[PDB]
Write a protein that holds these residues in place. Structure first.
Motif, short mmCIF file in Angstrom:
data_model
loop_
_atom_site.label_atom_id
_atom_site.label_comp_id
_atom_site.label_asym_id
_atom_site.label_seq_id
_atom_site.Cartn_x
_atom_site.Cartn_y
_atom_site.Cartn_z
N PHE A 72 0.79 -1.23 0.00
CA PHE A 72 0.00 0.00 0.00
C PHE A 72 0.83 1.30 0.00
CE2 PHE A 72 -3.98 -1.97 -0.03
CZ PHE A 72 -4.02 -3.01 0.89
N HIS A 73 2.12 1.23 0.38
CA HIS A 73 3.03 2.40 0.38
C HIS A 73 3.66 2.54 -1.01
CE1 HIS A 73 4.00 2.99 4.90
NE2 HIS A 73 2.94 3.68 4.55
N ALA A 74 3.86 1.41 -1.68
CA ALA A 74 4.50 1.44 -2.95
C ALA A 74 3.54 1.75 -4.14
CB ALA A 74 5.12 0.17 -3.13
N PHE A 450 8.23 2.20 6.81
CA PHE A 450 8.13 3.63 6.56
C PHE A 450 8.26 3.92 5.07
CE2 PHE A 450 12.81 3.27 7.19
CZ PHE A 450 13.27 3.99 6.09
N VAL A 451 7.55 4.95 4.63
CA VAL A 451 7.56 5.35 3.22
C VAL A 451 8.59 6.42 2.95
CG1 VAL A 451 5.93 5.64 1.33
CG2 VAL A 451 5.15 5.57 3.68
N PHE A 452 9.01 6.48 1.70
CA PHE A 452 9.93 7.51 1.24
C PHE A 452 9.61 7.66 -0.24
CE2 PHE A 452 12.39 3.67 0.26
CZ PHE A 452 12.96 3.97 -0.98
N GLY A 469 11.01 1.63 2.97
CA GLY A 469 12.37 1.46 3.45
C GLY A 469 12.58 0.56 4.65
N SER A 470 11.50 0.02 5.20
CA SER A 470 11.65 -0.88 6.34
C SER A 470 10.57 -1.94 6.46
CB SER A 470 11.70 -0.08 7.64
OG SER A 470 10.42 0.45 7.96
#
Lengths: 522, 527
Positions: A72-74, A450-452, A469-470
């Protein structure tokens, strides 16, 4: 084809990022059977096969490529404005039916409570199937995500955008059928497709809304008081069986990205301060506290911690993260250390950190955690443990420490939804794993890292590619990615709760659960 | 090799950026005889022919690759802290000799005025050449850029970092030679080289400073007034050869990125308001104005435009820019248009854009310029004119319009040098090409395009790669990149100017030139 070549180029770049900065890579391989080289090649194939592919086609291909990660972050966003929209919001009941819970048009052809049966003669379920991701796992979180898209298609998201007229087959409350002809609200693309232009280029010559403040739940009963400020909070009552009433406090946490809260004045006291105000009122005029955390996108971890510190009089263990490293993270580590070198007292800690980190109280212990974090990052780097390091707590925070002033200590009931992500996953995970609150509703989405974001010049029209990233790791092991958190009490929304947006069955069970919390204590 | 593979990967990414978003590409091929593919192939070979290439080695290779563009704007910075520094400052005089103009350490042997001869037995010139870029063209600007690094080596910039003692051979003004053994101030690397870590990586399992506020020029004469804010500004009396005295203003513009000004307080009024105050004082208490713009890194175009708007009473034609376009620029164009869709009046413009844009007064004219900008970009995009577009003015501003309240209209003399970049290239070019001011000093550097930065996760330790997205073109067709802007009067600093930091020869000539401007007697000639 110029477009094809740029798309391949940009695809190869995204592919490299997945190998150097995507922490959940190993997980997706086992949990989904996903393979990077496989998908890459596969995506390359669709690109090379197309006859004079359009930019939008290539964007769709890359978007699906990233979508295959079932993260869901990607995702990938593009510099494109083409979109299609229909003024309705539909929600799925626990029995599997779809009802219109929101109508944003003056047309009365479709009303609240009506059931959605088909779109252009195709059962709703089939249509949603066309909006699913490459590696759909059939979870409710994935389904709800697709439902968000049913009546809102955006090229900026790599969606294939429809237009023109369509027919919605609906079922009225008395049971009969109606076929409603509607026309999509279309916004044509304003960013010219490279493919159309390519040939002429010459060489240069010299509140059912995620993050909704109010949410969608009506108050549980006669209201004795409310706040109406930044947060939606109020105090109502619950009557047990022996006829005794109990003042219950209610509060909704819409997002953990405070700067984005509805009506936030950057020139006014921060939202965590208003939170404290509410908690205090609840502390001496409430018996228990219901916290609605559904439909929350997540946000700032430090802010998430600030709010957590005000809901406990005891320390709360925090899950750790397995990080993927590059020298960028190494420099951050070095920077924390040089920044806290001579910090030995609370006074010095507040001067170096600001005494308040997005609401979180800065202690000498904070500086110590930040110090530990970094020494650990540096250790992992020198050891070569950089693909997916051993769990390290974000910011070094081993656990949450109660807020020095405001500390709600009475029983808490947290309501979760399949539309709770990241910090919205972590909130219930922390309260549940520390046994501070009762979790109710449906399992969270599972955005456990976490998102970046990454931006880069390109001609495929790629605006941003967010990554993870994690890999968060819960105390007893077990990742949050995809899995999310199961509530203590699985209480899905029924057709009766949703249809007329009353949530009577749902709220009745919650109020009863809160009673047992007050009486049986925990 | 892990490090090598990543280096090649990131190199390939940079190379691709050079074809998609590097506007000066066509210019470099012609000005330098540079070729992208070939420079890339060369870099690749350097990486491939290496045994166990360290990360710092690969960083140097990537940095040299970008350094080959001979673009003061184009460069790579890395997540690395290793560095070497020596507390001295040298300045090259017009006769080609290097002199120490500053000493920043305890009382030691080297004195201001000493001539630097060698570094470890090697003449300064040779040492400097080792610091040049791949396509060095021998310009004064490139020389000074190299000099900046003579006593400052940074792995963050891709430099090889030295350490230990080194000997500086100097000559005293009276003639004798001295060898001064000095020790580099060294900072070791804190970011472990990936090459070293690679074998253990297992699979995952579950002053003279550029931008200085005061600069280095001494007062031109007895001060009658001195400003007390952020800018160095004053009024002195200048006398001609007949002994006739004139009141002249002196103002130094240190940088165009206003936020980086020394002692700037973000909670107080913006620097353009103070600038406006100073000009109003100059307009009523002065006969001419000297603007020292030397050693200025450039900055914000809109701010540069605001300052220009207060130095004229007539519009000033602006050079346009040839841009490289991607759909990112297309969205910008669309947004400007939707933003100003219903703006038909001044009040409307001010509401949509603010009363001013970084000092530049907002008008309907401004709104119309911005809309024109959007249309031209969209037009270029639809025509495929995206590699190096037809000239389009930044923000659509065809010309600078005079500030409504403060307009200096008396003669102006601008001082420039080889350490003036971007906006500091533009400031004198606008004033020169519009015949508004007398430009004096030495040719500017030539960073003739706007910069933009790129960041992306990688294992090569790359932090940022700044590139150039446009090529400015002067009214008459000449580009600014590399070539810079020539002054009306070439006035380099002599050894006598530099030897004891008096610049009396330079200053006396600037004063003679200013007196001629005040006189308004024919053509302005040096002598």
């Amino acid at each position: 084809s110029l477009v094809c070549k740029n798309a391949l180029q940009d695809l190869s770049f995204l592919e490299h990022l997945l190998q150097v900065k995507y922490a959940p890579k190993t997980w997706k391989e086992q949990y989904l059977g996903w393979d990077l080289v496989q998908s890459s090649v596969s995506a390359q194939q669709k690109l090379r096969t197309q006859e004079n592919p359009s930019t939008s086609f290539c964007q769709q291909v890359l978007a699906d490529f990233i979508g295959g990660l079932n993260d869901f972050h990607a995702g990938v966003t593009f510099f494109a404005i083409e979109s299609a929209y229909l003024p309705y919001t539909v929600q799925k009941s626990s029995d599997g039916r779809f009802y219109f819970v929101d109508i944003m048009t003056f047309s009365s052809e479709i009303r609240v409570g009506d059931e959605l049966l088909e779109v252009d003669g195709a059962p709703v379920q089939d249509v949603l199937a066309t909006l699913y991701g490459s590696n759909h796992k059939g979870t409710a979180a994935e389904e709800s995500a697709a439902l968000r898209t049913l009546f809102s298609r955006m090229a900026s998201l790599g969606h294939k955008v429809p237009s023109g007229r369509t027919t919605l087959k609906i079922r009225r409350p008395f049971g009969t059928t109606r076929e409603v002809r509607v026309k999509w609200r279309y916004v044509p693309e304003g960013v010219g497709d490279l493919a159309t232009i390519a040939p002429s280029i010459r060489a240069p010559q010299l509140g059912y809304n995620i993050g909704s403040t109010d949410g969608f739940l009506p108050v549980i009963g006669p209201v004795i008081w409310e706040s109406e400020g930044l947060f939606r909070a109020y105090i109502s009552s619950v009557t047990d069986g022996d006829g005794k009433s109990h003042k219950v406090g209610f509060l909704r946490i819409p997002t953990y990205s405070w700067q984005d809260m509805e009506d936030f004045d950057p020139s006014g006291p921060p939202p965590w301060e208003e939170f404290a105000k509410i908690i205090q009122v609840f502390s001496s005029n409430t018996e228990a506290l219901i916290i609605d955390q559904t439909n929350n996108p997540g946000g700032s971890v430090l802010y998430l911690y600030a709010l957590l510190s005000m809901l406990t009089d005891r320390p709360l263990e925090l899950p750790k993260h397995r990080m993927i490293l590059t020298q960028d993270e190494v420099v951050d580590a070095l920077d924390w250390l040089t920044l806290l070198e001579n910090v030995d007292t609370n006074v010095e800690s507040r001067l170096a950190l600001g005494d308040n980190m997005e609401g979180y109280t800065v202690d000498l212990q904070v500086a110590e955690y930040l110090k530990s974090f970094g020494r650990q990052v540096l250790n992992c780097w020198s050891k070569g443990d950089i693909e997916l390091s051993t769990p390290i707590p974000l910011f070094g925070f081993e656990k949450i420490h109660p807020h020095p002033r405001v500390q709600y200590s009475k029983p808490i009931c947290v309501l979760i939804n399949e539309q709770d992500f990241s910090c919205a996953d972590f909130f219930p995970v922390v309260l549940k794993d520390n046994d501070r609150a009762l979790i109710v509703g449906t399992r969270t989405a599972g955005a456990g890292g976490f998102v970046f974001n990454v931006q880069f010049p390109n001609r495929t029209g790629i605006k941003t590619c967010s990554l993870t990233g994690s890999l968060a790791v819960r105390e007893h092991g077990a990742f949050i990615e995809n899995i999310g958190v199961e509530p203590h009490i699985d209480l899905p929304f029924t057709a009766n709760d949703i249809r007329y947006k009353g949530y009577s069955e749902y709220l009745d069970k919650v109020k009863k659960l809160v009673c047992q919390l007050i009486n049986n204590d925990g």
